Amino acid sequence: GNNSSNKVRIVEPSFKMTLAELLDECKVVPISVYGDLEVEITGIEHDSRLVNSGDLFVCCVDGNLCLIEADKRGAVAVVASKEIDIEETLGCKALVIVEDTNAALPALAAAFFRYPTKSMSVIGITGTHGKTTAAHLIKTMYEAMGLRTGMMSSVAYYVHGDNKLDFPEANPDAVLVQKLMAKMLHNGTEAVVMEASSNELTHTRCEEIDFDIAVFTNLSRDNSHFQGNEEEFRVAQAKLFSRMVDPDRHRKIVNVDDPNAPFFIAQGNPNVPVLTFALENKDADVHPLKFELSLFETTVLVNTPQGILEISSGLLGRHNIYNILAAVTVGIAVGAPLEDIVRGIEEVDAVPGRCEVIDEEQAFGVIVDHARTPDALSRLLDSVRELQPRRIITVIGSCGEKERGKRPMLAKVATDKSDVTMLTSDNQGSEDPLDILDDMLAGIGWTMQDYLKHGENDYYPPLPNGHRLFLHDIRRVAVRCAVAMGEEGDMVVVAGKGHEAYQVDGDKKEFFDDREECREALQYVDELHQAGIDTSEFPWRLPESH
Amino acid sequence: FARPIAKKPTFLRLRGLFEYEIQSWKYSIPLFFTTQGFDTFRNREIST
């Protein structure tokens, strides 16, 4: 528009407000208040290592050494848990000590930030699969329809346009949430796409958030250690729908394809209207009457409430079709036109580090995913089965810590669904890479003792299903040969980490991107055409030796 | 040009033992050799 390259100004209003107004706005009974509330509030924080002069510094902990740190800094409020007197050890400013800093922390932040979620289209999205992809597509669609959009996830933070505020740890407290919320509110943005993470809704956060649209894309059973019973999983995840209070400015997007869609709806204000997406279940408001998925082509004739529309794109993935269905249903909730929905859908061609298709003049689809669980590789393998290519190669990473129970079943599904498998050393920050490669096969039926007795005689084995064995450690050569395998129209997965733009091997840290190396290898395919005999299993790349 | 068979895998095709006495090798193998970096191929193995 104006510049499109210079950074947009950090237009943050420095809030001016006093402690008595704070107590009146959010009436919390004091237990350890002294003196008088003669203090001007200048900022807000929770952690002493980020506490500056004049912030809230609220977090539940007893006998903390951070009290002295905040006293040195000069925080306006210094309240962890402990009854502490004034003018001797905490003479920096006044005290407003509350019973539970976590309970009133969203309340105090909203009162200080003037409750910015009321003046925004704050959308929380629940579910298990495709959360980040759904957030990306929804934010692109919302930005397309003539209005700015924000982003509140655990992987990235898009303030507006294309600048990315550095993504912090999985979930900080509500102080950072409301700080970035103020940035959205006063930086030209008028909406935000918030991921309703389990830790977010568990840690007393959604009490002081006004949700405009609540979306339920897909359901799956994971992290069952935290959700000890399926009832807790179905109720805690239903807190997103329970926050709904106004069935005239708020809408419900539900997945009747999943079994518990009415169950999710019934957990609070069913009057808020239900708009449903489902592909296999044609009894939905938005449904792709025609569905076609290929390795490089994808066609969807979808009968939205507006009408029947054709969507053609190379963004593969059946769950990606489900996600696009959820996005168009969300657009229907706000009454957005189909043309703007298509513009938003096509506004993204490669979501960062997930399902990132690379086509640098080649017929083998390079694709990566987060792949922090074996079920992610299993799901991508089922998608590949649904999108049957000629030859299947999947480069398998490793496991960081001592979670040795995943790689057996991971290698099982890989070798069962891939003609040729491949392994590498992606994340092994715990032990030696050789031991990590040894652990890769630990539960399914083949023993690596043969890897001991190679002697130029075991290089040509056909594992259980006649498929091919695989072993390597040098990540660069591993991915180079993985891209170098692709002959014509085969499957070339080099996944395992996703958007992780580095590489760790026990005690190392350097720059390493999988996508960049993949496109570089696609470029050197021209040099690769000069040779390439003895291609199938092992070894590779060296001619004039037969 | 010796080929050390060792712990590291041998993704490079075949092994070879040694062959460097022909005057043609000054510019014959460079077309087949390297082709992807210098240290990432020559220094991995085939030491002299």
UniProtKB/Swiss-Prot annotation, chain B:
The chain holds residues 147 to 194 of 677 of the full protein. It is found in: Plastid, Chloroplast. It comes from the Eukaryota. DNA-dependent RNA polymerase catalyzes the transcription of DNA into RNA using the four ribonucleoside triphosphates as substrates. Belongs to the RNA polymerase beta' chain family. RpoC1 subfamily. The gene is rpoC1. In plastids the minimal PEP RNA polymerase catalytic core is composed of four subunits: alpha, beta, beta', and beta''. When a (nuclear-encoded) sigma factor is associated with the core the holoenzyme is formed, which can initiate transcription. This is DNA-directed RNA polymerase subunit beta'.
